[PDB]
Amino acid sequence: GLFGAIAGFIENGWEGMVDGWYGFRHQNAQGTGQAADYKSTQAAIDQITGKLNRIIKKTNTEFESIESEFSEIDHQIGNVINWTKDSITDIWTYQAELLVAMENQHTIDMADSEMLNLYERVRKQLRQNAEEDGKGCFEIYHACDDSCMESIRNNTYDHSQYREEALLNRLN
Amino acid sequence: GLFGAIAGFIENGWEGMVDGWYGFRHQNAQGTGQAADYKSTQAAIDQITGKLNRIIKKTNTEFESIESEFSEIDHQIGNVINWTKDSITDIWTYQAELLVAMENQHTIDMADSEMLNLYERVRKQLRQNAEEDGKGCFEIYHACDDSCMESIRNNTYDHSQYREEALLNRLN
Amino acid sequence: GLFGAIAGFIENGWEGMVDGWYGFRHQNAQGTGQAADYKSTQAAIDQITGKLNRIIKKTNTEFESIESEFSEIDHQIGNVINWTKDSITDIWTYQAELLVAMENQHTIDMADSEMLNLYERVRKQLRQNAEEDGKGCFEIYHACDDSCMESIRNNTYDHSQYREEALLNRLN
Amino acid sequence: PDKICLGHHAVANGTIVKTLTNEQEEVTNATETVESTSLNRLCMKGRNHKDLGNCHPIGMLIGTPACDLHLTGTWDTLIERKNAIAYCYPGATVNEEALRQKIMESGGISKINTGFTYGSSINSAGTTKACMRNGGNSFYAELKWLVSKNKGQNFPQTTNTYRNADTAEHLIMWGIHHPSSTQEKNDLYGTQSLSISVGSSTYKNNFVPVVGARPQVNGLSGRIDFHWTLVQPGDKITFSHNGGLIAPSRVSKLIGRGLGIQSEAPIDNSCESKCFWRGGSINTRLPFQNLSPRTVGQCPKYVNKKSLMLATGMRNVPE
Amino acid sequence: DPDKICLGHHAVANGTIVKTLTNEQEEVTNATETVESTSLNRLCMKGRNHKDLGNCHPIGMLIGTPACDLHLTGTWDTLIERKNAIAYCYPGATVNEEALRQKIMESGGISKINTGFTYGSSINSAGTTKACMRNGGNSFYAELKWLVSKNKGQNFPQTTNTYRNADTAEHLIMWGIHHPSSTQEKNDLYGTQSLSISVGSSTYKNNFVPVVARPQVNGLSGRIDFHWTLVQPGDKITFSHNGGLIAPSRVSKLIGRGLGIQSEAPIDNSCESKCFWRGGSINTRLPFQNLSPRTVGQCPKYVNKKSLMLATGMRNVPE
Amino acid sequence: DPDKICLGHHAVANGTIVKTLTNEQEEVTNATETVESTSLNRLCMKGRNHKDLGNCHPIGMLIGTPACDLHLTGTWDTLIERKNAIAYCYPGATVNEEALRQKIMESGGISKINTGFTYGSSINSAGTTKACMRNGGNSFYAELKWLVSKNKGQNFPQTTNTYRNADTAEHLIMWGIHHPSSTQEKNDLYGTQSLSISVGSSTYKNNFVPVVGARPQVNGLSGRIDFHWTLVQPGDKITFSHNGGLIAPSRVSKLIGRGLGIQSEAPIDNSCESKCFWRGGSINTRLPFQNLSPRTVGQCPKYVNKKSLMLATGMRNVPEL
Ligand SMILES: *[C@@H]1O[C@H](CO)[C@@H](O)[C@H](O)[C@H]1NC(C)=O
Ligand SMILES: *[C@@H]1O[C@H](CO)[C@@H](O)[C@H](O)[C@H]1NC(C)=O
Ligand SMILES: *[C@@H]1O[C@H](CO)[C@@H](O)[C@H](O)[C@H]1NC(C)=O
Ligand SMILES: *[C@@H]1O[C@H](CO)[C@@H](O)[C@H](O)[C@H]1NC(C)=O
Ligand SMILES: [Ca+2]
Ligand SMILES: [Ca+2]
């Protein structure tokens, strides 16, 4: 993918996570947890909603019949109508194929970008108190209880509180 | 946004900055300053100019009248013309709506990318002598006078000259 | 470009590299080397192949003649056909110009992204044992023989083996 | 060391979509953009509609028996059916398809009496076995078959003139009877050469009843060919004839605009639609459709595509 | 306490709303319009060898109606027709009127060629009417002659006139057939005899019988209906007539190509344009336009959109 | 003194210029053309049961002009009309000419069916002309008969002829009306009487009067034979009431299946394959667009007003110096 997270450095998705699109799993002394990120899940859903609002629509143009279902039309004008309609249908077929292909590419890469933006938000929060796993995880070099983990998810984690402890553990 | 800088980790824009699109604010002993980045501002403007050159155009195809303004036309051919013109107008309306929507998305994300590319250029310049604020700022761990700040903006800052001082301040 | 690697922090391309699109150059005690990355080269080529499969095609719609080559046509229907064909040609000309412009933009940025994703994969592998050059190179702070370099390319480099040596060299 | 992992959801059963680069890309969710489902009914709920059933639109102007329920009215939707009857007595209409199309764009028909009266030497109420009504022989309700009262006698050279007193244009229709044999012609209109002149400010034309052997349609070799023209407000149309004219009792006035539908599908006044085709209605919110290239109303665009799936979620990467 | 360098982007107090793929209300720093709503109520004719026909209808320049006297020949790259323009001084119409008008309005000029036609002593070539006034005195179509008997009541001499196309390009020949009001008027001008008018070329062939009651147009129940055909190079057209023919003095030749404009808007030779409509000129550099679906020349495409704003700056994130 | 691993991308000496959304002169490593400029000046007929009409105009196949004698019946999937092809030996035209031509050029073959029409002793069926030469001797349209009186001046017998369609598919019946030069010629062939020709089916009905008037000579003949046509549905009859001036069919035609009609001056080639044709020949390209002609037939790349449109197939080229 463009942003290298989904089908990238994050090996696979979580079938277990059913309350959001993006979120966290942690392990500390006290045990394991899982929680969804609202802000980033809603960002992705709202952008997809926007596309559906734009694409699931028809023109309000009223078209009348120019081909009789039940009677023969002059052969020359019939051939012009047939040529014109088939030309219009080739254009709309092409436009439809390109629209969906293009939007599908954007939707996938957009979703990839929202995952990466969350990862980068956390990376910067943890500052010098953590290191990148390579698999989308952060090894935290201090006791991070369920209250500390909550502070990372809620964007209230203060790196300065745990800095001295963390740098000692990192340098060893 | 796709690149997570503008309407992202950078909290808001600067109404005060009127000599460029992207730039720096610094605080040192000497006081406060602000300066625009030319290279990255011109990169964004040149790409938008390119779009306007491609989009602000009509075809040089000469079209003649097929509908008389002042006299009645044969009813059958009139209905064919009406069907054809309305079909063409539905296509152009759609193409116009999609073009502008697609370019607008790209322009915004392109501008986001130029901001991020500047941030990443600075991050790499400062190497081990600075740490990420999380709000698009770099905390520099050494005396950086107005001449040092200028060296960061002008892409001439040599990390090796301040390294030993900076690492001591960082480890404390 | 969008991802800031190709025509970005990587100053130029390698005319010398003729066995792949992306790859590595290293310098150690033992000397200099160059090798192509298969996975990332094939990723870029497969995406471009996909585009060619979608774009190098015509519709299977059978069109008949509505203009006689060898005889004069009624003047009114001739003008309608001329107007319709010119309108259709304006649409296809526009669609063709936009398709190629849009795909060209995507191909370039896609290739940029595959370069960056490889750089970021390596960055994370080396963890605290290396520092970013700023020019797309990694300064490794330990003896990295041709076998160690091979381990970086093959994604088998274990940072923990060289960590204590590297951190000492980095802090001095 | 403690550990915090970032991740995204996945699903067991993902959906395949096409991208710019990949023909088989698995995502968590997708939705269809092309409608393949039709309702085999004409959804007429919001609509002052008129189902002509057995009646062909031209039949409502000349008043064929089958059209007796359809000689006047107002509508926003008119539904023509297959094998609908326009002519009880065999014949055709010059510019048939232009007239049919004109009626099917209309939003109703008003009728206006022509007032035409004929001398004692003309029989106005000529009838045929083909146009049955109340179980007895009859004729087109809006026209009169003018014949001599004394069989064989030459037809009185007569003149009838309709004036348009209205503020809007009127659609006048008449017939010319082309008999099978010279025996039948002389029997009804007399031995003399026949001429029928029709003249207005705008329109002018002459008609000669041609006599010649032809195949039997409903056991009748005779033909009544119908003609028509618009009569502008305040303008007159005059019918100079010495026999062979089928004269109008009433002219027609097409009012406003309406959606013409040709379909075999039954009506349903519970269901709403703005898009119709031969096979019924299309109620879909989707932008495209692969049911028919022949549709009428506000319609999704026809595409040569079974399915086009639009991704509504990220790449599905299972474990 | 550590020194600090911050990165940031501009913003503005008054941002503009644009539509993106994902967001209907996206605020950016700057945007520009892509749909033109403004027209100039003038025909911008700078750099154009134009011809304003004013009161003259294009068909009138081929037959030579008084109003068209200044427009019988010339060269142009642009021809401007006006509302209620006069084609016929004497009441009548032209078969294939709109095909002929359209053909003239694509042309880049008209040349005239003498037919050379001469008539015996028993024919009056210079027949005149009160309807076609010129120099304040009775006259007729400049490019045609009204052929009548010199002795009133006398039968019209069976005459034959033939035009040969000596040129390398096709010529447009026009003639008229006079359909008189009454059998009294007909016998008075052409005589009691049955009238026939034959016209024949290699390609074209047709017969015309002057049909004889109708309402008065400018107080005249008489009609002169006009016909036309192309005559290929080296080919002849022959007029066999025993009275009732309105014969050409000159044939016409349409030269090169030109842009036909139907508009009520005045001329302006200071302003330049390549796009025109009923309401005037469209000079915009913008790709789209919502003024009219009826335009001519090199035009922005018509769209069903008031406004389409194209972002020319980043997201506006104010303080 | 520190070890170092550098990441990079390939480049090439000679890069190619493409257009993007933002940049008109963008250099990439490789690109490929999307617009075809090359045509083959030949009709590529490999795998096609084709028919080159050469000198024969499609309408000529229905009425049987000499030039068309080798093209009166057959089956094809491709029919090739040529420039200045002959439809009419005797001067005249066909009402709805272009609708009929177009109808034949969509067909996949022609069958012929005898009408069976017979005429009294007072009618000469085998009327001939100097214009329609065949076997080096005077002749006429093979599928029609020129009906004239056998005794010159004599009024033409009021005759009635009726064709029934016994077949399961519709048949294309054609007839002619002879419009003579002078009142002398008319009275000479059909007699002094006023002439009328009625044609009637279930669906079709029309009357025709042979008009007489002076006109220029085409192949030294001032006379005209104008042709008319209609479809006759299965089980339906068409009846010809005429008192002289009718050119009556000996045979009706049946158009079978479907075929691709091509108008071209280009020679045939049964070695080469194509599904797209124009005046100038064939278009074999796999490319999606084409700038050769807006007038094409078959499965074709779309016409564009563009010389070249280069599609990037590689990254930005950033060369070493
Ligand atoms: C137009 O197309 C329909 C089917 O798409 C076909 O049945 C019909 O015959 C065509 N009309 C002409 C005049 O070829
Ligand atoms: C074509 O469109 C215009 C505007 O809708 C309308 O006035 C005109 O009557 C239409 N023509 C026909 C023949 O229906
Ligand atoms: C239609 O366009 C072609 C373009 O060359 C031209 O030759 C032809 O004469 C045009 N027909 C009319 C009626 O303008
Ligand atoms: C927006 O762009 C145009 C330049 O074409 C200019 O009129 C306008 O002043 C620009 N900026 C703002 C902030 O309005
Ligand atoms: Ca067809
Ligand atoms: Ca209409």
Side-chain angles (χ1 to χ4, degrees), chain C residues 13-15 21 23-25 27-28 57-58 63-64 68-69 89 93 97 104 108 136-138 140 144, chain F residues 3-10 19 22 258 263 279 288 295 298-299 305-306 310 312 316 318 320:
Chain C
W14 296 332
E15 294 179 31
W21 286 27
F24 311 82
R25 285 183 178 170
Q27 176 186 221
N28 55 11
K57 267 185 186 152
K58 44 166 198 193
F63 288 92
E64 298 174 354
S68 185
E69 300 284 357
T89 293
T93 298
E97 280 170 339
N104 286 356
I108 285 166
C137 301
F138 294 100
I140 304 162
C144 193
Chain F
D3 288 349
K4 125 171 282 161
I5 189 165
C6 289
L7 288 104
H9 57 87
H10 73 172
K19 302 168 185 281
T22 64
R258 288 300 283 187
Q263 287 177 312
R279 181 144 184 169
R295 300 183 182 195
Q299 304 174 28
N305 294 115
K306 270 276 125 156
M310 296 305 288
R316 269 195 181 95
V318 199
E320 216 134 355

Side-chain angles (χ1 to χ4, degrees), chain A residues 1 6-7 10-15 17 20-29 48 55-58 60-63 65 67-71 89 92-93 96-97 100-101 104-105 108 111 115 118 136-140 142-144 152, chain D residues 1-10 12 17-21 25 27 31 80-82 97 100-101 259 262-263 278 284-288 293-294 296-305 308-315 317-319:
Chain A
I6 303 174
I10 295 166
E11 283 173 19
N12 61 77
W14 294 332
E15 300 185 42
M17 182 155 64
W21 286 27
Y22 313 100
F24 311 81
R25 285 183 178 170
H26 67 78
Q27 80 197 222
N28 55 14
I48 285 161
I55 295 162
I56 279 56
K57 265 192 194 198
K58 335 161 291 151
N60 68 352
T61 308
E62 192 88 14
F63 290 92
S65 186
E67 290 188 284
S68 183
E69 301 282 356
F70 305 134
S71 57
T89 293
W92 275 112
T93 298
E97 280 170 338
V100 172
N104 287 357
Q105 195 69 75
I108 285 166
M115 176 77 257
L118 183 62
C137 217
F138 293 101
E139 294 191 30
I140 305 165
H142 67 80
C144 191
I152 297 171
Chain D
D2 287 351
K3 205 197 300 199
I4 188 168
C5 286
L6 285 104
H8 58 279
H9 73 352
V17 300
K18 301 162 183 283
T19 73
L20 297 175
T21 64
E25 190 76 68
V27 294
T31 188
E80 169 184 349
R81 305 294 193 172
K82 193 183 165 195
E97 184 51 33
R100 190 195 70 75
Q101 200 26 246
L259 178 62
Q262 285 171 313
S263 180
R278 181 141 179 164
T284 312
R285 324 186 337 93
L286 300 197
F288 313 120
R294 300 161 161 203
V296 292
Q298 302 180 23
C299 287
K301 300 295 180 184
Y302 180 69
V303 299
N304 297 305
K305 268 277 113 193
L308 251 187
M309 296 305 288
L310 176 74
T312 54
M314 68 190 64
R315 267 195 183 95
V317 199
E319 205 211 61

